[PDB]
Amino acid sequence: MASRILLNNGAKMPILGLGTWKSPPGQVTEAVKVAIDVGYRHIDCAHVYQNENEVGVAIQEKLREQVVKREELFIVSKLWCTYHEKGLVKGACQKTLSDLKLDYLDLYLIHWPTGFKPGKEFFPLDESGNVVPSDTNILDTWAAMEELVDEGLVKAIGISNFNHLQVEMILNKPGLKYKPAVNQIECHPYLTQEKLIQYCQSKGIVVTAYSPLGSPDRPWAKPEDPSLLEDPRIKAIAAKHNKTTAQVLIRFPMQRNLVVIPKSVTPERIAENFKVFDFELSSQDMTTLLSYNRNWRVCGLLSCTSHKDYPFHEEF
Numbered sequence: 001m002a003s004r005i006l007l008n009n010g011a012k013m014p015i016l017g018l019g020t021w022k023s024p025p026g027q028v029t030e031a032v033k034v035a036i037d038v039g040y041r042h043i044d045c046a047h048v049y050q051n052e053n054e055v056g057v058a059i060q061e062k063l064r065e066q067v068v069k070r071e072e073l074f075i076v077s078k079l080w081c082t083y084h085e086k087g088l089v090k091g092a093c094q095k096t097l098s099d100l101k102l103d104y105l106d107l108y109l110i111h112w113p114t115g116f117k118p119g120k121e122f123f124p125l126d127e128s129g130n131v132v133p134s135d136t137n138i139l140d141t142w143a144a145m146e147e148l149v150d151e152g153l154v155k156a157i158g159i160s161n162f163n164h165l166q167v168e169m170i171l172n173k174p175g176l177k178y179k180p181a182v183n184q185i186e187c188h189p190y191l192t193q194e195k196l197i198q199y200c201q202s203k204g205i206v207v208t209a210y211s212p213l214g215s216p217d218r219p220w221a222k223p224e225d226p227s228l229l230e231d232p233r234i235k236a237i238a239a240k241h242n243k244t245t246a247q248v249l250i251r252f253p254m255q256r257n258l259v260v261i262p263k264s265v266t267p268e269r270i271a272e273n274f275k276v277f278d279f280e281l282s283s284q285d286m287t288t289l290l291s292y293n294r295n296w297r298v299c300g301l302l303s304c305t306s307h308k309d310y311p312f313h314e315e316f
């Protein structure tokens with residue numbers, strides 16, 4: 001299938017990107033270099049991942065080598081929760097730009113709808129372990145994101161982990177200047193997200209699926225959790241197509257008109273994961289994979305469940 005999807009800012013976004021959460025700083029430079037060498041043109045980053053400097057070393061070296069041109073890359077980062085304040089957004093974006101070695105981002109996302117108290121800690125806590133909120137609302141944070149477009153720092157802005165009512169709040173914002181281009185959400189066969197995806201797509205917002213392999217390296221994994229990569233039903237579909245389970249899990253969101261961002265630091269897997277443009281899942285395969293939904297989430301924190309903007313109390 002076609003490699004890029006058209007966004008509502010008029011730019012094209014590669015439907016396959018490389019994830020970088022948990023990629024160790026001593027491995028991620030080589031991972032990104034390999035990824036670019038084997039065809040990746042989209043890298044998903046974030047300040048909170050603590051490895052943007054090292055991602056940037058790889059990007060800058062592949063630009064210097066003229067393996068790629070800057071206009072052929074699609075670099076995404078995200079505004080962390082402790083920077084939702086009007087006066088902090090530009091500096092947060094600039095720190096990311098400096099670290100990534102870039103003079104603009106292709107896409108900058110509000111990482112989570114929950115704003116936290118600014119400071120050095122990424123998760124400021126009270127003495128009982130609840131996150132300490134900011135009083136800055138999502139609409140004022142969105143206005144600050146719009147400024148970044150108007151200053152040339154970012155080509156597109158979007159959101160991540162927003163539920164449909166939160167997306168709707170953005171879309172209904174008085175004086176809205178730029179619609180979100182993307183909502184980046186968790187999505188895989190155990191969390192299929194039909195309702196939220198349909199809503200976003202109906203509004204022209206492109207959905208990016210994160211943790212498409214079920215994030216087997218997530219730090220809070222428990223032995224009893226379900227495992228996509230080991231699910232015999234998914235392995236069977238992969239065997240029928242002579243592809244790996246990971247390749248099926250990556251192709252699945254692609255055929256739903258989603259962008260997908262599998263993470264790896266393993267060179268062989270980085271290359272394997274890109275070899276997904278040359279086979280098709282049938283409609284029956286797609287519906288079968290959708291049938292595995294169990295509303296199982298990788299990402300979501302106990303410490304945030306009383307924040308006024310916690311996204312996962314709503315059904316979708």
Ligand SMILES: NC(=O)c1ccc[n+]([C@@H]2O[C@H](COP(=O)([O-])OP(=O)(O)OC[C@H]3O[C@@H](n4cnc5c(N)ncnc54)[C@H](OP(=O)(O)O)[C@@H]3O)[C@@H](O)[C@H]2O)c1
Binds near residue numbers: 018184214229246298
């Ligand atoms: N917006 C958000 O709030 C948010 C939240 C979560 C994730 N994300 C983004 O989405 C990206 C992907 O999600 P994720 O990192 O949670 O997990 P994931 O991509 O679902 O899974 C990554 C894990 O799968 C392994 N893996 C990769 N390719 C494989 C293959 N072909 N065969 C077997 N195992 C394979 C990786 O191992 P190795 O690396 O050891 O090869 C790693 O342990 C993140 O890195 C981040 O960029 C965003």
Ligand SMILES: O=C(O)COc1cc(F)ccc1C(=O)NCc1cccc([N+](=O)[O-])c1
Binds near residue numbers: 048050114302305311
């Ligand atoms: O948020 C991501 O992209 C992946 O997960 C993390 C990555 C990090 F580097 C550090 C922490 C997380 C993490 O716990 N992320 C989960 C998370 C964050 C913020 C708010 C909530 N919430 O439920 O409202 C959940």
